User: Fold Transthyretin from Homo sapiens.
Amino acid sequence: CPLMVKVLDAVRGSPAINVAVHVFRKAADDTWEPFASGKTSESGELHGLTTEEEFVEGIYKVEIDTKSYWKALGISPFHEHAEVVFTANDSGPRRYTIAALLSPYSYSTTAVVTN
Amino acid sequence: CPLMVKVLDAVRGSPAINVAVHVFRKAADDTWEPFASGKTSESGELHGLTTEEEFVEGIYKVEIDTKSYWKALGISPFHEHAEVVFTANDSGPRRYTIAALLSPYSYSTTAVVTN
Amino acid sequence: CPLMVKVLDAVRGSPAINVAVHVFRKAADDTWEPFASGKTSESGELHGLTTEEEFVEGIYKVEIDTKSYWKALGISPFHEHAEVVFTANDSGPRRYTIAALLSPYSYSTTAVVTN
Amino acid sequence: CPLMVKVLDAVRGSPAINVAVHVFRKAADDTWEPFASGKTSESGELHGLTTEEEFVEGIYKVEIDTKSYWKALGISPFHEHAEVVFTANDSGPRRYTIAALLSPYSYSTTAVVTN
Ligand SMILES: [Mg+2]
Ligand SMILES: [Mg+2]
Ligand SMILES: [Mg+2]
Ligand SMILES: [Mg+2]
Assistant:
């Protein structure tokens, strides 16, 4: 599993369940090409987005649909989404965990990179 | 001043100085159009981005060039940029402050909306 | 002003107003002794906690009464308080700003040290 | 496992390994009584701190030794430690995950509470 996403809810103190996550890869013409997508599980985790064969080097954008998450909870979301952008595999293959902590007017994200 | 941006460095415990900040507004065709830009001051603040007349309701993206900031300090960064995408709604007098806290492998962003 | 505290609310996107803040300094016997205290203003800021003469090097603890803040808003909080424990060292002219971002089940705290 | 602690390093983009974590429980005389302690693993996780039988209701303080962590990495730590304080099991037994993200001048913490 080369790319995992974990999402937590800072208002309820819970995993953020059934949150849509879209991954794009920067194309040669500087446009964002669809790469992978999924929904977080009951643990707030999204495994199986991609495979080692598909996950090449490049610039990736992980978009987390925070707006739908907050709307479903009847909360006024400020952010449309989170947009985590990073270069992956530039020195060779790595495993990446993108973690995000969500509040209506704030978000924090970190990455755990393992060789 | 309807839109202010403040950037802090969590490694050095200091304002993030001379950081490029680009603001985009979502156009009718779903593309991101340039709206305002500047560089943070010695206090890590960016004032005078826009005016009350120009800052209408809409979907905005604030992109902070964190990659150049870390590279100039000789610290290896993970992200290309730190950001906030949000909806600006007129619900009485409002001033938006977008604050970002930077670390090489993480960032936090919050919005303070005041009257 | 050698020590300032700023508190923000990540649920409402606003300053956290009238929040009690207590500052302690580590005594010789390893106990926490009261040092300064106050309440945040309408801007979520607390100025005038101490003076240059009183603020010596040492280990300080800033305790923010987040539990009372959330209870007054009718939101169930997790933490008793949000905090920062740090060492204050004189390395040229220094001003400390302790900023805290609050959510019911999370908080972030940072220190900005300036000249 | 009723109480788990997970610690991440925002500078290196890694789990914070071999970080000391001390848990105290507030005693009848308002003093902090030792309750459990351990070190984070290679995954930055600390499992097996306590048992369901030992983990009664009360006010708990989770102290993370951030100072030793940063000193071992040759980084100038601002914080002495992190001090996460919360009431546990007041409505009946719950499982708690305390997560912390560390930077030299900042820290973020969240709690995941499951029934
Ligand atoms: Mg390459
Ligand atoms: Mg409108
Ligand atoms: Mg000294
Ligand atoms: Mg009870």
